[PDB]
């Protein structure tokens, strides 16, 4: 069910689906600028202090 | 002699001023010479005032005070008692301990500027970067599913 | 050896050596020679007890 | 020093002042929490 | 006897040492640690701790 | 051979704009887009509130009678104020209000040279007994400046320092198009600022900053 | 900042199991309230960053400061006094960073391909700077096999014996090498005198390299080489593309059939025990052996179904961290579980 | 957390207390713990989650506590996480924050 | 000079070059410590024998002197 | 806005064709805004002339055997790609290298046409043994950066147009007593014999000044001032 939901991801405000069905996404290195070569798993997690 | 509500105090600042009757034995030769020359034998005290501990600062929130002149319950020989409450707004910092719900704990090594942070295609930067090598060997895959 | 002696004598127990060390560092002089740990005197007195 | 052998950390011949007894005790007892039935 | 008393079974060691009127030579790592003396190892060995240092005459001229 | 590059602006909304830079060297669009985006996110000058002052309170951790939110929650609401100031000096705004009703940014009376760009933002909710009287010192700077302490300045007990977020831009990103005998890259910046300034002004400020910085290279 | 300069401090973390639990460092003033600790000394301290605290002692006397700078300095103690193995060696992240950096991918972009017809090879480069230029453009991959002329690197024993005079070489001498740009950049960290490796850098290989460096080269050379290795390993671990997702944790495809088969064996064992033929302890031992076999079969099936570039397999097999039983437990089957008696 | 002991309409809401008016005519008032120190130094602070005039049922949450958000235990924050090694600043369980 | 790169102020002179001056690391420690407190006695007794830094620890000065072979020692 | 000051630039000269440069102090986060851009500009945006394609007589089809010399065609191309040359003609210009008899051919044995200039005459090319002769054609033209291999007897080579060879940067931290987190940029550059690292750095600076002046032209507005 999680695998299926990873495909139904609604786009953002610009119509782009930022996260693919593997849960990964292409990120850009904010220091150099070149995009990171491989897709990296991104998402939202509950973090405590 | 009490700090004022709302004041900002730092390490070593005085919160409540207190003076204690000074023991005659510990009078240094210089103090003895002065008290014998001028004869100022009036209201002899020493500084035992409350101070702020090391590594502690913040805004003073409230002050509660109980006196013996006013009818309050205090232990034997205690004339006055004053509590001062100090609050601090602690932002997240290096070395502070974060953790998820799956046993994945960690302290904060570096907080990068929002530009140094890797960002998605539309420019949304990530908020926290968890290393990969930690995940598979602890046997908490629930964090990946939660993500 | 000198580190271990400094840790156990002039940093912990020497009552005349710690003040001497502070006085020597304040005036920029060399560190003096350590003395006798006071806890050893306490051990001797407790053995006498 | 000659009968003992080289020093593991330095790789050269063990110096004189070295206290090899405590080093040996530490070396034997440090991976002690790894022995299981 | 000091090392044995600090290690384990202090009461028995102390009784036995008092009966035999034991005099500790006071030359051991733990002994020198307890009494606050330089330990007989490493930089505490006589040949290392009593080294004399002075510049050479050729360098003392310059 | 090298054709002189051009910068052509597109517009999506009043606060968001796409820019197109072309032609560029192959593999050169990513680096330029990043060197622009970093300066856009970090060092764009703007204006924000530095310290506030409420009459009935002497510190941040208390409650104003009648209002619904505590002073700390009120400050967290004021953290969302987008303002623009031409004075470039400490200038004081005022706000008097009495309930019932609700206090918003439109109820604040800004002095000359400054203006609030979202009057509809919620600040506090007042009742019959609620009375809100606030002064807000507004200044102009860049980046993020944490609350200036009352020990650093000659401030007094009533002054409540607040965090200052001087960034006028909201979200910056970029994308490149590579084209492979004649290879070249076309860069597309996407800049969304707050209603304080237009993306044209933000990108112009970043361009001047980077020109001034690279001028020492020659 | 003036009184701190060249005044070493002692860092200790309990439990101090061996003498490396206390080490001397040069303090650098940092912002914050945390003690920044070099990532290589962790193996000596058994220190992770899950909330660990360390203590700092300040030597005062000249003899104590000398003992800190000489006897207890961090860069002086690189080898375990127990087994002589390297402890300041790249540990886990760095490992992957180098394991990805030196492995050769057959058929990558820019890979050397022989000339066919009117098409040249385009697999040779004059200098490694030319390879760096070809890598900045999208043509050359770092993990692709190419042929480069190396002027500032030393060749292996056989290549130096054939092409040059044995024990004779000079900076600027040129030689052809069919390697990856990654292996070139990795050997660029190793000193000039060290022979070229051209091997996939499993953790054991770099352990052997550091053993050789400590056996032959000075201690300070090793202390700088390990820092260069740390930097390269981290930089390339960022771009090694090792993450974790639910799709990267692949369930074995034949798990259902294997479990059905071994549970059928166990059911036959239970049927045999139902008639009283099989002994109780014999039944327990038989079921234990059955489920051990099934666990290992599921592990083998998982090892077969997993690509060799899978991030889990890459992390485990590179020697960075973890073992294969953890992978068998994560995806596949954990197996038998302990009892109160054992 | 602050829970209604009896159904009614909220009569007044302040940062200090919440006064409700039951259906039988009786009043009730709940005072808010504001910036109260805990046994371990954490801050216990309560904030009303209802507005004046709302009709609440018996047992509804009227004000949130320290780690409560509209009625549920909110012990932390939802953060955008990316899982990748980054320049060794997340080496060995260290964490990198934005 | 050798293949080692430039040390960084506290790791110089390299320990591999200083251990060639004495028989053991402990003797080197005592060597440097006695020379250093001798130097500090001079400032309040001979030396420094090399050019001192603008502000330099006397231990580092003694180490540089030992590296320069401008002094003798006897066990 | 605000005012920043004292962002000095200094140089350390290792060799005549290689030097390090230090930009300090830079404001926080600006060490990486300048670092990658300067490197990519030095590498890919500088005008320089180099070899594109060549033709070697004697053997054309084998492409691996050549009489008179021991070097293969691959090593010949390797020696040719490292030849530094500067041309001002926009059109591709052809040069010729001819040398007979046993000996050693250098880059000075080449006859440069009008306009072009070879800067490494002492560079080794090939060695002719007894009864050997070498006659080869070269095509030289201008460009920027680096481009891979793009009539019988003709072979295209890898054109190294960039007058710089190897550029790498690093970022450290030095600041005032209030921040201690400013950035310092260290840029190690190693160039050819065409131009010094100084002129390459100045050219990259001018090209980037023009690039970002394209954006600054949109409006004359406030930004960080300098001293
Ligand atoms: Mg731990």
Q: The domain that contains G104 carries what CATH number?
A: 1.10.274.100
Sign of the Cα torsion H83, H87, H92, H97 reads: negative
Alpha-carbon distance H43 to nearest alpha carbon in chain G (angstroms): 23
Please report residues of G whose CB lies closer than 8 A to that of A40. 241, 243
Residues J99, J144: one domain? yes
Residues J78, J121: one domain? yes
Neighbours of D29 (CB within 10 A): 11
Give the residue numbers of the binding site of D for Zn(2+). 3
Residues G221, G120: one domain? yes
Q: What is the 3 state secondary structure string of F71-134? A: HHHHHHHHCCCCEEECCCCCEEEEEEEECCEEEEHHHCECCCCEEECCCCCEEEEECCCCEEEE
Residue found under tokens 């049922």: H57
Name subunits touching G (3+ CB pairs < 8 A).
A, B, C, D, E, F, H, I, J
User: Cα–Cα distance between A43 and A23 in angstroms, integer?
Assistant: 8
Residues G160, G222: one domain? yes
Pair of tokens at residue J191: 């160039």
Edge-to-edge strand list for the sheet holding B80-87 = B8-9, B58-67, B80-87
Is G247 an 8 Å CB contact of chain B?
no
Q: Are the C-beta atoms of residues I40 and I48 closer than 8 Å to each other?
A: no
Least Cα distance to F186 among F1, F18, F15 occurs for F18
The conformation of residue A47, written as its DSSP 8-state character, comes to E
The conformation of residue J100, written as its DSSP 8-state character, comes to E
User: Cα–Cα distance between F14 and F10 in angstroms, integer?
Assistant: 11
Contact check, Cβ <8 Å, G63/C30:
no
Is G312 an 8 Å CB contact of chain H?
no
Residues F50, F157: one domain? yes
Least Cα distance to E22 among E14, E12, E30 occurs for E14
Q: Where are the domains of chain I?
A: 1-75
CB-based contacts of G89: which residues, under 8 Å, 6+ apart?
A: G40, G43, G203, G206, G207, G210, G226
- Angle at which helix F199-214 crosses helix F29-42, to 10 degrees, equals 110
Residues G230, G303: one domain? no
Residue found under tokens 């032209």: J217
Residues G231, G258: one domain? no
Touch of G by C (3+ CB pairs closer than 8 Å): yes
Resolution of the deposited coordinates, in angstroms? 3.3
Q: How far is CA J29 from CA D16, E17, H94, J184, in A?
A: 53, 71, 22, 10
Pair of tokens at residue F30: 């990513």
Residues J227, J145: one domain? no
Is D9 an 8 Å CB contact of chain E?
no
E-strand stretches of chain H: 2-3, 8-13, 17-22, 27-31, 36-37, 43-44, 47-48, 55-56, 61-64, 68-69, 72-73, 76-83, 95-97
Helices (H), B1-147: 29-37, 134-138, 142-146
Least Cα distance to J29 among G174, F129, B116 occurs for B116
Please report residues of G whose CB lies closer than 8 A to that of J166. 129, 132
Which stretch of DSSP H or E encloses residue I7? none
Contact check, Cβ <8 Å, C31/G67:
no
Neighbours of G40 (CB within 10 A): 22
Which technique was the structure solved with, according to the deposited record? X-ray
The conformation of residue H19, written as its DSSP 8-state character, comes to E
Q: How far is CA C21 from CA C12, C15, C18, I43, I44, in A?
A: 12, 10, 5, 18, 17
Whether a cis peptide bond, with omega within 30° of 0, leads into F23 is yes
Q: Which residues pair with H61 in a beta bridge?
A: H3
Touch of E by C (3+ CB pairs closer than 8 Å): yes
CB-based contacts of I35: which residues, under 8 Å, 6+ apart?
A: E53, I47, I62, I65, I66, I71
Residues F172, F120: one domain? no
Domain final residue, candidates J161, J187, J209: J161
Pairing outcome for strands J164-173 and J8-13: unpaired
Edge-to-edge strand list for the sheet holding J18-26 = J8-13, J18-26, J183-191, J164-173
Least Cα distance to H14 among H54, H56, H51, H64 occurs for H51
Phi, psi of F117 (to 5 degrees): -110, 5
Pair of tokens at residue J42: 């030095």
Contact check, Cβ <8 Å, G81/D27:
yes
Please report residues of G whose CB lies closer than 8 A to that of I58. 62
Phi, psi of J76 (to 5 degrees): -65, -45
Nearest by CB to residue B6, choosing from F42, F58, F171, is F58
For the purposes of burial, counting CB atoms within 10 Å of the CB of J177, is it exposed (0-12), middle (13-18) or buried (19 or more)? exposed
Residue of B111, B112, B113 to mutate for J, most J C-beta atoms under 10 A: B113
Residue of J149, J218, J220, J225 to mutate for F, most F C-beta atoms under 10 A: J218
Q: How far is CA G42 from CA G13, G22, G210, in A?
A: 10, 12, 17
- Angle at which helix G93-102 crosses helix G203-216, to 10 degrees, equals 100
Distance G51 CA to ligand 1 centre (A): 6
User: Cα–Cα distance between F92 and B29 in angstroms, integer?
Assistant: 58
Q: Are the C-beta atoms of residues I24 and I31 closer than 8 Å to each other?
A: no
Q: What is residue F167's three-state secondary structure?
A: coil
Is D17 an 8 Å CB contact of chain E?
yes
- Angle at which helix J197-216 crosses helix J31-44, to 10 degrees, equals 110
Q: What is the 3 state secondary structure string of G218-249? A: CHHHHHHHHHHHHHHHHHHHHCCCCCCCCCCC
- Angle at which helix I25-42 crosses helix G62-70, to 10 degrees, equals 140
Is G94 an 8 Å CB contact of chain B?
no
Q: Are the C-beta atoms of residues F103 and F54 closer than 8 Å to each other?
A: no
Q: What is residue G263's three-state secondary structure?
A: helix
User: Cα–Cα distance between G164 and G175 in angstroms, integer?
Assistant: 9
Contact check, Cβ <8 Å, A27/H77:
no
Output the domain CATH number for residue F175: 3.30.1360.10
Please report residues of E whose CB lies closer than 8 A to that of G67. 43
Q: Are the C-beta atoms of residues F150 and F129 closer than 8 Å to each other?
A: no
Output the domain CATH number for residue J75: 2.170.120.12
Least Cα distance to I29 among G75, E48, G73 occurs for E48
Distance H90 CA to ligand 1 centre (A): 14
Pair of tokens at residue G47: 């220190």
Residues J98, J188: one domain? no
Please report residues of H whose CB lies closer than 8 A to that of A46. 75-79
Pairing outcome for strands H61-64 and H2-3: antiparallel
E-strand stretches of chain G: 9-12, 22-25, 55-57, 124-125, 145-150, 175-180
Least Cα distance to B109 among B99, B126, B90, B96 occurs for B96
Nearest by CB to residue H85, choosing from G49, G230, G238, is G238
Of all residues in chain I, the one with the smallest CA distance to E62 is I49
Pairing outcome for strands B58-67 and B80-87: antiparallel
User: Cα–Cα distance between J32 and J182 in angstroms, integer?
Assistant: 12
User: Cα–Cα distance between F105 and F108 in angstroms, integer?
Assistant: 5
Which structural domain, as residue segments, surrounds residue F206? 1-45+167-218
Give Dmax (Cα) for chain C. Answer: 43
Domain final residue, candidates F166, F190, F210: F166
The conformation of residue F4, written as its DSSP 8-state character, comes to P
Nearest by CB to residue G17, choosing from D8, D10, D26, is D26
Angle made by CA atoms B14, B19, B23, in degrees to the nearest 5: 135
Q: Which residues pair with G137 in a beta bridge?
A: none
Q: What is residue J139's three-state secondary structure?
A: strand
Pair of tokens at residue G93: 């992240």
DSSP string for I12-70: -S-HHHHTTTSSSHHHHHHHHHHHHHHHHHHT------SPPPSS--HHHHHHHHHHHT-
Neighbours of G47 (CB within 10 A): 18
Residues G195, G323: one domain? no
DSSP string for J165-212: EEEEEEEEE---TTTS--EEEEEEEEE-SSS-HHHHHHHHHHHHHHHH
How far out from the chain centre does Cα F46 lie? 5
The conformation of residue G19, written as its DSSP 8-state character, comes to G
Name subunits touching I (3+ CB pairs < 8 A).
C, D, E, G
Q: Are the C-beta atoms of residues H94 and B107 closer than 8 Å to each other?
A: yes
Q: Are the C-beta atoms of residues F51 and F162 closer than 8 Å to each other?
A: yes
Q: How far is CA H18 from CA F82, F123, H32, H51, in A?
A: 32, 20, 8, 10
User: Cα–Cα distance between G97 and H88 in angstroms, integer?
Assistant: 10
Least Cα distance to J199 among A37, F217, F99, G170 occurs for F217
Sign of the Cα torsion G331, G336, G338, G342 reads: negative
Residues F190, F147: one domain? no
Q: How far is CA G218 from CA C23, D7, E23, E49, G215, in A?
A: 41, 15, 48, 27, 8
Please report residues of G whose CB lies closer than 8 A to that of F29. none
Residues G305, G199: one domain? no
Least Cα distance to G257 among G248, G265, G269 occurs for G265
User: Cα–Cα distance between I38 and I73 in angstroms, integer?
Assistant: 13
Give the residue numbers of the binding site of G for Mg(2+). 48, 50, 52
Give Dmax (Cα) for chain B. Answer: 83
User: Cα–Cα distance between G172 and J53 in angstroms, integer?
Assistant: 27
Distance F52 CA to ligand 1 centre (A): 44
Alpha-carbon distance J31 to nearest alpha carbon in chain G (angstroms): 17
Least Cα distance to D9 among G272, G78, F60 occurs for G78
Q: How far is CA H74 from CA C16, E5, F70, G5, G262, in A?
A: 57, 57, 20, 47, 46
Sign of the Cα torsion G58, G61, G64, G70 reads: positive
Q: Are the C-beta atoms of residues F108 and F149 closer than 8 Å to each other?
A: no
Q: How many CA atoms lie within 13 A of J101 on its CB side?
A: 1
Q: What is the dihedral of CA H68, H69, H74, H78, to 10 degrees?
A: -160
Please report residues of C whose CB lies closer than 8 A to that of G68. 3
E-strand stretches of chain B: 8-9, 14-16, 19-21, 45-47, 50-51, 58-67, 80-87, 97-99, 105-111, 128-130
Helices (H), J60-120: 73-81
Q: Are the C-beta atoms of residues F28 and G136 closer than 8 Å to each other?
A: no
Number of domains into which chain J is organized: 2
Residue of J161, J215, J219 to mutate for F, most F C-beta atoms under 10 A: J215
Nearest by CB to residue G18, choosing from D7, D11, D26, is D26
Least Cα distance to F210 among J174, J38, B122 occurs for J38
Residues J89, J156: one domain? yes
Residues G266, G179: one domain? no
The conformation of residue H44, written as its DSSP 8-state character, comes to E
Q: What is residue J137's three-state secondary structure?
A: strand
Q: How far apart are the first and last CA of chain I?
A: 30
Query: Within the 84-113 window of chain B, which residues sit less than 8 Å (CB to CB) from chain H?
Result: 85, 87, 92, 98, 105-112
Contact check, Cβ <8 Å, F65/H16:
yes
Residues F93, F120: one domain? yes
Neighbours of G5 (CB within 10 A): 17
Residues F177, F148: one domain? no
Nearest by CB to residue F59, choosing from B61, B114, B124, is B61
Touch of C by F (3+ CB pairs closer than 8 Å): no
User: Cα–Cα distance between G303 and G327 in angstroms, integer?
Assistant: 9
Least Cα distance to F170 among F14, F9, F33 occurs for F14
Which structural domain, as residue segments, surrounds residue G302? 254-342
Give the residue numbers of the binding site of G. 48, 50, 52
Least Cα distance to G291 among G255, G323, G259, G332 occurs for G259
Q: What is residue C26's three-state secondary structure?
A: helix
Of all residues in chain H, the one with the smallest CA distance to F74 is H15
E-strand stretches of G175-309: 175-180
Residue of G30, G31, G32 to mutate for B, most B C-beta atoms under 10 A: G32
Residues J154, J220: one domain? no
Of all residues in chain B, the one with the smallest CA distance to G322 is B137
Residue list, CB under 5 A from ion ligand 1 = G 48, 50, 52
Residues F15, F110: one domain? no
Contact check, Cβ <8 Å, C30/I41:
yes
């Amino acid at each position: 069910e999680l695998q299926g939901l990873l495909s139904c991801t609604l786009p953002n405000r610009d119509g782009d689906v930022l996260v693919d069905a593997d849960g990964k996404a292409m990120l850009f290195d904010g220091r150099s600028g070149e995009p990171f070569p491989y897709p990296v798993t991104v998402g939202y997690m509950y973090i405590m202090k | 002699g009490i700090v004022r509500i709302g004041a900002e105090v730092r390490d070593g600042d005085i919160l409540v001023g207190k003076v204690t009757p000074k023991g005659e034995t510990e009078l240094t030769p210089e103090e003895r010479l002065l008290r014998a020359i001028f004869g100022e034998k009036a209201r002899e005290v020493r500084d035992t005032s409350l101070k702020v501990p090391h590594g502690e600062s913040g805004k003073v929130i409230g002050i509660r005070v109980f006196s013996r002149e006013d009818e309050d319950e205090l232990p034997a020989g205690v004339n006055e008692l004053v509590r001062v409450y100090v609050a601090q707004k602690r932002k997240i910092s290096d070395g502070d301990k974060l953790a998820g719900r799956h046993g994945n704990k960690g302290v904060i090594g570096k907080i990068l500027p929002v530009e140094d942070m890797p960002f998605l295609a539309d420019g949304t930067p990530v908020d926290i970067i968890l290393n990969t090598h930690g995940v598979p060997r602890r046997m908490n895959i629930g964090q990946i599913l939660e993500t | 050896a000198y580190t271990l002696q400094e840790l156990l004598t002039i940093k912990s127990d020497d009552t005349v050596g710690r003040v001497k060390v502070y006085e020597a560092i304040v005036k920029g002089e060399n560190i003096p020679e350590p003395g006798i740990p006071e806890s050893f005197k306490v051990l001797l007195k407790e053995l006498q007890s | 020093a000659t009968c003992y052998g080289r020093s593991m950390a330095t790789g050269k011949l063990v110096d004189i002042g070295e206290a090899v007894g405590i080093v040996a005790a530490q070396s034997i007892g440090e991976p002690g929490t790894q022995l299981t039935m | 006897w000091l090392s044995a008393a600090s290690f384990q079974e202090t009461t028995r060691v102390l009784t036995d040492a008092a009966i035999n009127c034991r005099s500790d030579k006071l030359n051991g790592l733990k002994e020198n640690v307890i009494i606050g003396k330089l330990i007989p190892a490493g930089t505490g060995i006589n040949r290392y701790r009593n080294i004399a240092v002075q510049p050479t005459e050729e360098a003392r001229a310059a | 051979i090298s054709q002189r590059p051009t910068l052509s602006e597109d517009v999506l909304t009043d606060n968001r704009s796409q820019f197109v830079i072309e032609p560029l060297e192959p593999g050169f669009g990513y680096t330029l887009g990043n060197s622009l985006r970093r300066t856009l996110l970090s060092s764009i000058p703007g204006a924000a509130v530095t310290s506030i002052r409420i009459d009935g309170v002497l510190h941040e951790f208390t409650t104003v009678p009648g209002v619904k939110e505590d002073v700390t929650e009120i400050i967290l609401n004021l953290k969302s104020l987008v303002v623009s100031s031409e004075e470039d000096e400490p200038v004081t705004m005022y706000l008097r209000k009495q309930g019932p009703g609700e206090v918003t940014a439109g109820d604040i009376v800004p002095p000359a040279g400054v203006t609030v760009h979202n009057p509809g933002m919620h600040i506090a909710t007042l009742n019959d007994k609620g009375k809100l009287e606030v002064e807000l010192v507004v200044e102009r700077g860049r980046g993020y400046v944490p609350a200036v302490q009352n020990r650093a300045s000659g401030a007094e007990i009533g002054r409540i320092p607040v965090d200052s977020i001087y960034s006028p831009v909201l979200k910056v990103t970029y994308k490149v198009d590579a084209t492979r005998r004649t290879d070249f890259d076309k860069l597309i910046l996407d800049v969304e600022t707050k209603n304080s300034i237009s993306p044209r002004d933000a990108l112009a400020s970043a361009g001047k900053t980077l020109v001034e910085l690279f001028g020492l290279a020659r | 900042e003036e009184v701190i300069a060249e005044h070493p401090v002692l860092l200790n973390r309990a439990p101090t199991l061996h003498r490396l639990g206390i080490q001397a460092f040069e303090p650098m003033l940092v912002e914050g309230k945390a003690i920044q600790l070099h990532p290589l000394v962790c193996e000596a301290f058994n220190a992770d960053f899950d909330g660990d605290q360390m203590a700092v002692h300040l030597p005062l006397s000249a003899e104590a400061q000398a003992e800190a700078r000489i006897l207890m300095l961090s860069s002086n103690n690189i080898l375990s006094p127990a087994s002589g193995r390297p402890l300041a060696m790249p540990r886990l992240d760095m490992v992957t960073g180098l394991y990805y950096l030196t492995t050769e991918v057959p058929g990558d972009t820019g890979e050397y391909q022989p000339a066919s017809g009117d098409h040249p090879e385009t697999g040779v480069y004059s200098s490694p700077a030319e390879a760096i230029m070809a890598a900045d453009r999208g043509v050359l991959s770092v993990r692709a096999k190419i042929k480069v002329r190396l002027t500032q690197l030393r060749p292996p024993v056989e290549i130096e014996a054939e092409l040059f005079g044995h024990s004779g070489w000079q900076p600027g001498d040129a030689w052809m090498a069919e390697t990856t740009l990654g292996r070139v950049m990795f050997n660029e960290l190793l000193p000039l005198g060290y022979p070229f490796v051209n091997k996939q850098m499993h953790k054991k290989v770099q352990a052997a390299i550091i053993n050789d460096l400590a056996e032959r080269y000075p201690m300070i050379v090793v202390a700088q080489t390990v820092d260069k290795l740390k930097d390269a390993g981290f930089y390339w671990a960022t771009r090694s593309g090792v993450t974790v997702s639910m799709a990267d944790v692949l369930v074995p495809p034949r798990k259902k059939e294997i479990l059905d088969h071994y549970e059928e064996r166990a059911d036959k064992v239970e049927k045999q025990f139902q008639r009283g033929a099989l002994n109780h302890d014999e039944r327990n031992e038989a079921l234990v052996e059955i489920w051990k076999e099934a666990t290992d079969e599921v592990g083998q099936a998982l090892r077969e179904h997993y690509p060799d570039d899978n991030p889990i397999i890459t992390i485990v097999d590179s020697g960075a961290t973890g073992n294969f039983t953890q992978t068998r437990t994560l995806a596949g089957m954990k197996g038998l579980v302990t009892n109160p008696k054992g | 957390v602050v829970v209604a002991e009896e159904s009614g309409v909220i009569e007044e809401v302040s940062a200090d207390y919440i006064t409700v008016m039951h259906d039988n005519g009786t009043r009730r008032t709940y005072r808010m713990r504001k910036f109260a120190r805990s046994n371990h130094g954490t801050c216990a602070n309560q904030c009303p989650i209802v507005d004046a005039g709302d009709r609440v049922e018996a047992g509804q949450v009227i004000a949130d506590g320290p780690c409560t958000d509209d009625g549920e235990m909110a012990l932390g924050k939802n953060l955008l996480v990316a899982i990748m090694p980054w320049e060794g600043h997340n080496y060995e369980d260290a964490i990198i924050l934005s | 000079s050798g293949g080692y790169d430039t040390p960084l102020g506290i790791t110089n002179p390299p320990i591999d070059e200083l251990l060639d001056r004495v028989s053991s690391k402990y003797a080197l420690v005592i060597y440097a410590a006695k020379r250093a407190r001798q130097i500090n006695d001079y400032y309040n007794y001979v030396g420094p024998l090399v050019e001192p830094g603008l502000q330099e620890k006397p231990l580092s000065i003694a180490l540089r002197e030992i590296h320069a072979d401008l002094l003798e020692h006897t066990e």
